[PDB]
């Protein structure tokens, strides 16, 4: 297991966003041409084992631990009735006090805030990716497709990402092999070597959130200089077309940087290889 390994994302120009927005309120449009310099992206979402190495090294206490609660999806025991603030829910106890990560060391770390993610990535000699880096990487060398792999949800009748099957929120059939999270190395990689870029855990990016984008061509854009929420990408194991079609690379959502939840993690990026 090399779950802190990075892959080289090649230099290129790509179309960020879409002129066929599916969630218009989220500023998926307009499509815009963005140039990205070559850099490195973590192949995997940061796992419990990998975060535990960080915590072991630094003593870091996450914002959820200090606040004393975090958001948990009701189905596995607020922004929606199915999100409950649970006392003692944190990265070690993802559904609250009497849950554990002992049996899921290779699953993505959860209940990590934007600040927690920055702390980890910087500790690791890395950083968060920008939204544009994240989206470019998500698209995996394909142009204007819905998903990392193309436009079909189940190409060749195969599951390609961990999202919801069944009637949300009452019934998760586990058709794709996982009701909650999957191991960070589950499912096929995309064209650049990334696993679970869409689905599984949401991923923080460095950008402040806005819904107002120009069509001007940009180079290594960093997002707006100010805001109140940071951008997160890719959707999660909770997402279903019926209520939440956010497992597309162009999709985007937000949370305040001190926020944490049972479907939200991250991966790191770097300009160059670290030690």
Ligand X SMILES: *[C@@H]1O[C@H](CO)[C@@H](O[C@@H]2O[C@H](CO)[C@@H](O)[C@H](O)[C@H]2NC(C)=O)[C@H](O)[C@H]1NC(C)=O
From candidates 130, 196, 254, 259, binder to Sr ion by CB under 5 A: 196
**Of 97, 78, 77, residue with least CA distance to 87:** 97
Number of residues in contact with Sr ion under rule CB under 5 A: 6
- Give 26's DSSP letter: G
Alpha-carbon distance of 149 to 142, in angstroms, equals 8
60 binding ligand X? (CB under 6 A): no
Residue 56: name its binding partner from Sr ion, ligand X, none (Cβ under 5 to 8 Å by kind). ligand X
Number of residues in contact with ligand X under rule CB under 6 A: 4
Residue 90 CA from chain centroid, whole number? 17
56 or 275: CB nearest ligand X: 56
50 or 176: CB nearest ligand X: 50
Residues 15-54 touching ligand X, rule: CB under 6 A, are 49, 52-53
53 or 145: CB nearest ligand X: 53
Alpha-carbon distance of 6 to 232, in angstroms, equals 20
Which residues have a Cβ under 8 Å from the Cβ of 198 and sit 6 or more positions away? 138, 147, 148, 161, 163, 234, 235, 247, 248, 249
**Of 134, 27, 89, 146, residue with least CA distance to 263:** 89
- What phi, psi does 6 have (nearest 5°)? -115, 155
Angle of the 114-123 helix axis to the 48-58 helix axis, nearest 10: 80
226 binding ligand X? (CB under 6 A): no
- Residue 77 CB, shortest distance to Sr ion, in Å, is 18
Answer whether 258's CB lies under 8 Å from 240's CB: no
Residues 214-243 touching Sr ion, rule: CB under 5 A, are 234
Residue 259: name its binding partner from ligand X, Sr ion, none (Cβ under 5 to 8 Å by kind). none
Residue 176: name its binding partner from ligand X, Sr ion, none (Cβ under 5 to 8 Å by kind). Sr ion
Q: Where on the chain is the footprint of ligand X (CB under 6 A)?
A: 49, 52-53, 56
């Amino acid at each position: 297991l090399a779950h802190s390994k990075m892959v080289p994302i090649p230099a290129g120009v790509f179309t960020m966003g879409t002129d066929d927005p599916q969630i218009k309120q989220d500023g998926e449009a307009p499509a815009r041409r963005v140039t990205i310099d070559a850099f490195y992206m973590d192949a995997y979402e940061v796992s419990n084992t990998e975060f535990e190495k960080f915590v072991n090294s630094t003593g870091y206490l996450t914002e959820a631990e200090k606040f004393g609660d975090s958001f948990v999806f009701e189905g596995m025991l607020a922004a929606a009735p199915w999100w409950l603030p649970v006392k003692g829910a944190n990265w070690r106890h993802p559904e609250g006090p009497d849950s554990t990560i002992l049996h899921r060391p290779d699953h993505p770390v959860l209940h990590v805030s934007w600040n927690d993610a920055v702390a980890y990535c910087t500790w690791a000699g890395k950083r968060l990716p920008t939204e544009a880096e994240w989206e470019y990487s998500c698209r995996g060398g394909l142009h204007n497709r819905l998903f990392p792999w193309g436009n079909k949800l189940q190409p060749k009748g195969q599951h390609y990402a961990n999202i919801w099957q069944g009637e949300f929120p009452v019934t998760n059939t586990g058709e794709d092999g996982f009701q909650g999270t999957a191991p960070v190395d589950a499912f096929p990689p995309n064209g650049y070597g990334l696993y679970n870029i869409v689905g599984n855990a949401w991923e923080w990016t460095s950008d402040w959130w806005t819904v107002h984008h120009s069509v001007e061509e940009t180079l290594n854009p960093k997002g707006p200089p100010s805001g109140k929420d940071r951008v997160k990408k890719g959707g999660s194991y909770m997402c279903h077309r019926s209520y939440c079609y956010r497992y597309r690379c162009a999709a985007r959502s937000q949370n305040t940087p001190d926020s944490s939840a049972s479907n939200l993690g991250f991966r790191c990026a770097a300009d160059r290889l670290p030690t």
